[PDB]
Symmetry: C3
Subunit: 436 residues, 3 copies
């Protein structure tokens, strides 16, 4: 009886499962690795740290490889609960990676916002907001240290660790640009908060110290790294209307084998606002009360999952004038594309089309070479922004092809592309194999 009687229940169908076993689940032989050690070492910041300033850092040569890089900020909030929305993330307006004077990659705060909405999830996502925002209903004058982790190719997997020991003739530098106005920190809407303190910044880099043999190999052999890059040519001007369904054809200007496309429609006035403001809880300032105004967001709750507040009705991509795929609704790129390829949840207003089976995986799993496409176009169709945004009965009970009239402020269309490239390192210098 018990488990022993199940072993005897053996048939001809068990041949495909346990005939001539190849593996066993009860004796794992673990692999031996190269000895190493990790150390986070602070960097020297060049320039005056402050709102709207540009500072830079030259990675000091302390170890052999570098992996994680974290930017620490110390901020004091100037409003009460729910008056900030990822202020430390917005403060890092853009960051540029440079090797030997050559730009390797460059990221922007809106990419950080888009990456978080698509590729982070669950408790990891909430821990990221602890690191970049106040999440415990803090009041005016609350001071907190923030940690903004960079997400370049060598920051996301140790298998792509940048070998400083193999770059003795090339300097690795980071160029930071700080935001000028950060909601709930030094500005409240358009009005500056008097006495707002300037931020304090520090850059920390995680170094890998290698053993003698592997140290000789990294310094003497040629290296080829399959890296990822971000492409972003600037915001596009979206033209959603309140009386009809407007349409647009945005000529894409991407290159290289691309893993996926990600885009959003943002109101440039408010950071991370990808949906329309409405008089429903969490969608505007003072929603549900007599102080409600659809002009100002509920800053702490800027994001939403309500598709009714998104602006995109349908979309398709055209490749040299012909449809790459049939037109799908905006909710398809927000719900189904992430469901099929990511496995998390994406707030409304952020859209994805993946050419890869696993876009969040470092291992390539399907790409499209935009360098061989003369004309790639994103054909868009917007909803009719005809719903009264101040009426909860109108917002919570309408049809599929309409949205709130406040959606006309979503005029900044940001389109991102993640591509692959090859970083060759030899003779103490590194350079990208493909420039377009």
């Amino acid at each position: 009886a018990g488990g022993l009687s199940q072993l005897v229940a053996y048939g001809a169908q068990d041949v495909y499962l346990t005939g001539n076993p190849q593996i066993t689940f009860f004796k794992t032989v673990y692999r031996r690795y190269t000895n190493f050690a990790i150390e986070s070492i602070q960097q020297t910041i060049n320039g005056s740290v402050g709102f709207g300033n540009k500072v830079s850092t030259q990675i000091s040569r302390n170890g052999d490889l570098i992996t994680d890089i974290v930017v620490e900020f110390v901020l004091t909030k100037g409003g009460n609960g729910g008056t900030t929305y990822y202020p430390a993330e917005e403060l890092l307006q853009d960051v540029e990676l440079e090797i030997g004077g050559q730009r390797i990659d460059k990221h922007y705060n809106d990419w950080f916002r888009t990456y978080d909405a698509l590729f982070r999830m669950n408790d990891d996502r909430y821990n990221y907001r602890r690191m970049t925002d106040w999440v415990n209903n803090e009041l005016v004058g609350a001071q907190k240290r923030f940690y903004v982790p960079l997400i370049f190719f060598f920051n996301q997997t140790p298998g792509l660790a940048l070998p400083l020991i193999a770059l003795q003739y090339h300097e690795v530098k980071l160029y930071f640009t700080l935001a000028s106005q950060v909601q709930g920190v030094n500005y409240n809407g358009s009005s500056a908060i008097a006495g707002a303190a300037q931020p304090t910044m520090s850059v920390w880099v995680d170094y890998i110290f290698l053993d003698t043999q592997e140290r000789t190999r990294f310094a003497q052999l040629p290296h080829e790294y399959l890296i990822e890059q971000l492409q972003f040519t600037g915001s596009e001007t979206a033209t959603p209307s309140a009386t009809t369904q407007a349409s647009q054809n945005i000529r894409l200007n991407f290159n290289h084998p691309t893993k996926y496309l990600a885009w959003n429609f943002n109101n440039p006035t408010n950071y991370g606002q990808y949906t329309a403001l409405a008089n429903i809880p969490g969608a505007c300032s003072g929603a549900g009360t007599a102080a409600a105004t659809v002009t100002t967001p509920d800053y702490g709750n800027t994001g939403t999952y309500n598709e009714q507040l998104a602006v995109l009705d349908s979309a398709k991509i055209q490749l040299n004038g012909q449809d790459r795929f049939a037109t799908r609704k905006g909710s398809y790129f927000n719900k189904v594309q992430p469901y099929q390829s990511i496995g998390g949840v994406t707030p409304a207003g952020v859209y994805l089309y993946s050419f890869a089976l696993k876009p969040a995986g470092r291992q390539p799993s399907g790409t499209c070479n935009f360098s061989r496409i003369d004309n790639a176009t994103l054909s868009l169709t917007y909803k009719t922004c005809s719903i009264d945004a101040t009426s909860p009965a109108a917002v919570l009970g309408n049809t599929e092809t309409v949205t709130a009239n406040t959606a006309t402020l979503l005029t900044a269309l940001n389109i991102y592309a993640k591509n692959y490239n090859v970083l060759r390192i030899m003779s103490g210098m590194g350079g990208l194999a493909y420039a377009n």
Copy 2:
């Protein structure tokens, strides 16, 4: 000092870890794959789409392989907040997969509900409810597009992609059956909502386009796929009592190497109701107020994690009259079996017994061949449904072997089995290797 001093801290115990390294963590060599392309293409639906109708789809031969399949619905809700519970999931009452006139697999909406409770988790689970339900407190007349993803063997992993190019003489068809009455959409309890609109449906299939060489291999060589199937012989009649602890012996009728058994006790009146209704928040209509009634659920909050509202007291499986394992409580199959083999959280009323180490993994990891077992029996023992369901003090403060008196409505016992089978494809035709 720092990391370099840790490298010198090297001893005899490091032999098992870093002696003669076999791998390294700082130089991943990514694998090269076969070139391909993906495209979601809409299908033609045969039949009249409507409540209680049967429609079918013949997969058009656009590409070489097919992977994901999504069913789109457009529904208009007829109630206010919390009056629907996965209506798009319930609308897809059953779906049958057919190759060359032969049924490969067939799923049911209650399986979709059971699969979601056991094998989805975290934000992925919440995104699935966005795709199949209203989750933003929408009101009467709210229209929304829903996406129901199918979970057949070729829908869950690209490694089992169905080769249409290798099936030139066999037709692949899907047979859908739409539910007649959907709570909060066209019915409110037992009463039909006047003017309810019929649903609109579309079927979308993701095709894989292969390169020349791999296209020749799929069309010329014989293929063998290790696939998974669902077994379900219909609901069993549970007989829980309010005066004593009833017991039952359900003769199982499964075959093939089975990964796991999953079952629930459902009140057939309400979709997804696996637990008893009670006058505690979320467990009945208007709970905690003067309008409370334990006759009607809080439809939007039909599920629960409260074990006190589950009906099963203990259970064991018998194999040819002898115990396959010792009797365990119902909470063991709801909490511990999922904890040990899945790693999520399962609402009360859904139970699991796994023969596999990783039941959610495609790779077989332990099965039981039910084709070699003459008598397999699920021995059940129910709690005494003696608690007053209208008393919060009685429901929130009782013992282990009792439940609410409303648990006597959980009379539909659905037992599911997930088994493996082999799909052989050769000479343009496909067929299963094992029929029993």
Copy 3:
């Protein structure tokens, strides 16, 4: 058009991705394993089960290997909602694993609490609280069965399953120690609850039944298992102050290659209290009301994510008098170290420093050999516990280096270390390869 036109978009950059494919994503060849069967079998408990008693279990020789071990408790709560905090976890005060009279590992309830805060996440974490606590607002007299899963080396992965068949001359035993006082079960603060019932306990072990060939191999060949151990030498006395920033140097006493260090500052009066109590919602009894008292916690909500209530200001580790790394804030070890190496969220008051790239992975990925370090020291600096804990305006709006004055009760410093060791099994006996 469509997907076929993307295949033709092929360039010279595709050489690194799809030239001479090595793998394919659309034809997975699954591996065949050794036939086995699993069965959970109840053990005999030696001794009188009760609060503050020591009981033991000798693993009966029913199967060939053992994997999961679960301890079942049945408890009756003596308070209302929010008056318990993981009572079943605290009840298992310590558990010791013994093979042939030799201790292999020993765990404590505070380690269970620390492990849960660091290495569990998402729905898995919530399911663990369902198994060890009341989570549905149960009232006085509510009875519930609890399941405490052990987390020894053979409990966390089947690849380290303990071979009882290879230990015919060595006895495997578990030594349990039950807590004396459990909040909300038999005590309310310092006052005993009259009529509190003694707990009932049962131990269940999952056995693996192997096929004939693999059974002969396990019983005849020598085995070497790379296992993990917990190190804990007892609580350290922390000395945080309310008038200045105190500092300490705790001489660590660890050995063997260590994966990570984890520590917390606990008020020994309250289980799992790692942060200061304050008059903000969830941080003290009756917070926000006229019955608020910062002397008693909100037991059901003892944990918090508010860094302002943590006590540690900065920390660094010294190796033979020299800095292993530069000083970082306490929030770095609570937010960034888990973000970089775990990927979940860790409540405030629990800190981590990882020597491994993946500390939660069984496969070694970086260690530090503490057996070769003469002096390892944890240098600590505490915040100034000068904030009025009864003032929400003072707690929700202060600076980085201060905390509530109630933080002076966090006087128990628990430092944990997870190391590797080798378990050799030969001639029917097992023994560890390294003792220090």
